[PDB]
A = this chain, B = another copy of it.
């Protein structure tokens, strides 16, 4: 069941009485045909944002960015695989020491890590543009369609994976919480694994800067809630791995006897 098979949000083309109403209005605009008209008051024209064609264009705008941004990730992996392959194929005619190989190996790992951070930022720019297009649709009826919930979740998933590569953990928390409230995305364990790490980063910074304990307790609690939830969704309840996490959480949290 591919929601994005047709590449649109809602299909667009019945009642004879309704067909009669559309006839008279269409003839009214025939007399008042003026392509150069520009409304001083935009309130009437702003209601066009509720039209189905408006949402079709916004959806395909955001969809277009997602394809470009995802292409950046895929093209980067293709070149990294190609670049590593070429390195082992070229002849090292001036290397006869073990430490020389390590330095040469460290050169490639610098180049590869240099290109990845460049690729992620280019992709993250596209995913940001896709997000803005999805958020300028004001029709709640069109916000519940299978096509909409498919792209909104796919954009967020590719956005967070790109954001986390750039060590920007605290920015992922608001997006992660909105991701786990769409369809059955809360049932996924990877969506809870990133939540475990993101709240752990905020736990350290509050402790490191000697901030309020109130923000520390809130971020620590959110970490334990989603760390345990992630294991439950992957290794299952009453499993030896689940038992281990209970020991850590009870050790880490506060219990009143």
Contact = CB atoms under 8 A, between A and B. Distances in A.
Interface stretch (A68-76, A167-175, A177-185, A201-209): A68-76
Q: What is the count of identical protomers in the complex?
A: 2
A79 interface: yes
Contacts of A67: 254-256
Interface string A237-257: 000000000000001001111
A78 interface: yes
A158 to B, nearest CB: 12
Contacts of A213: 68
B257 A70 contact: yes
Nearest to A4: B256
Contacts of A68: 213, 254
A75 B256 contact: no
Interface string A106-129: 000000000000000000000000
Nearest to A66: B256
Nearest to A254: B71
A251 B70 contact: no
The 9 tightest CB contacts between A and B, nearest first, are: A67-B256, A71-B254, A68-B254, A75-B251, A71-B255, A67-B254, A78-B251, A74-B257, A70-B256
15 contacts: A67-B254, A67-B255, A67-B256, A68-B213, A68-B254, A70-B256, A70-B257, A71-B254, A71-B255, A71-B256, A74-B255, A74-B257, A75-B251, A78-B251, A79-B251
Given A70-B256, A71-B256, A74-B255, 12 more contacts: A67-B254, A67-B255, A67-B256, A68-B213, A68-B254, A70-B257, A71-B254, A71-B255, A74-B257, A75-B251, A78-B251, A79-B251
